[PDB]
Structure 1
Amino acid sequence: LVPRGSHMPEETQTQDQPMEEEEVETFAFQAEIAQLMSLIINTFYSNKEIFLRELISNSSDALDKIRYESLTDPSKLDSGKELHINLIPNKQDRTLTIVDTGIGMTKADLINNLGTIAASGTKAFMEALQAGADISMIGQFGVGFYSAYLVAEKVTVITKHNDDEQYAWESSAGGSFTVRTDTGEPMGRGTKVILHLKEDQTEYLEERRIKEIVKKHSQFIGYPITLFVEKER
Structure 2
Amino acid sequence: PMEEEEVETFAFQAEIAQLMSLIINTFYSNKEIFLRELISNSSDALDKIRYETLTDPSKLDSGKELHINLIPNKQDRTLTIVDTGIGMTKADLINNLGTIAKSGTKAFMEALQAGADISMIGQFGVGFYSAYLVAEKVTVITKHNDDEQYAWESSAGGSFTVRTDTGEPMGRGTKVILHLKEDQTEYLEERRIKEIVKKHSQFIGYPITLFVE
TM-score range, shorter chain: over 0.9
Structure 1 counterpart SS, 2:123: helix
Q: Is the 8 A contact 1:87 1:225 kept in 2?
A: yes
Separation in 2, partners of 1:133, 1:80: 41
Let me know the Cα RMSD of the aligned residues.
1.3
Q: Tell me the TM-score normalised to structure 2 length.
A: 0.97
The whole-number CA distance in structure 2 between the counterparts of 1:209 and 1:193 is 19
Q: Do the aligned partners of residues 46 and 181 (structure 1) sit closer, same or farther apart at CA in structure 2, a change above 3 Å counting?
A: same
Verify the 8 A CA contact 2:70 2:81 in the aligned structure 1. yes
Match of 1:15 in 2: none
Measure, in 2, the Cα distance between the counterparts of 1:148 and 1:25: 22
TM-score, length-normalised on structure 1? 0.89
Does the 8 Å CA contact 1:155/1:193 hold for their aligned counterparts? yes
- Distance of aligned partners of 1:77 and 1:185 in 2 relative to their CA distance in 1, 3 Å threshold: closer
Cα distance between partner residues in 2 of 1:192 and 1:203: 21
> 2:94 matched to which residue of 1?
111
SS of 1:141 mapped into structure 2: coil
Unaligned stretches of 5+ in structure 2?
none
Maintained 8 Å contact 2:10/2:99:
yes
- Cα distance change on mapping 1:72 and 1:40 into 2, 3 Å: same
- How far did residue 78 of structure 1 move? 5.0
Residues 33-79 of structure 1 deviation map (CA, whole Å, 9 limit, x = unaligned): 00000000011111000000000000000000111112332213555
- Native 8 Å contact 2:141 2:149 kept in 1: yes
| Unaligned residue ranges in structure 1 (runs of 5+) | 1-17
Kept after mapping to 2: 8 A contact 1:106/1:164: yes
Using the TM superposition, give the Cα deviation of residue 80 of structure 1 relative to its aligned residue in structure 2, in angstroms. Answer: 4.5
SS at match of 1:156: strand
Question: For residues 124 and 164 of structure 2, what CA distance do their matches in structure 1 show?
Answer: 30
SS in 2 for 1:70: helix
The 1:56/1:199 distance shift into structure 2, 3 A limit, reads same
CA contact (8 A) 2:62 2:171 kept: no
Bigger Rg over Cα: 1
In the alignment, the residues of structure 2 paired with residue 79 and residue 188 of structure 1 have an alpha-carbon distance, to the nearest angstrom, of 5
Question: Aligned pairs, how many?
Answer: 213
Superposition misfits of 4+ residues, deviation over 4 angstroms:
77-80
Once the two structures are TM-superposed, the CA of residue 113 in structure 1 deviates from its matched residue by 0.2
Identity %: 99
CA contact (8 A) 1:22 1:182 kept: no
Give the direction of change, closer, same or farther, for the CA distance of 1:223–1:161 in structure 2 (3 Å limit): same
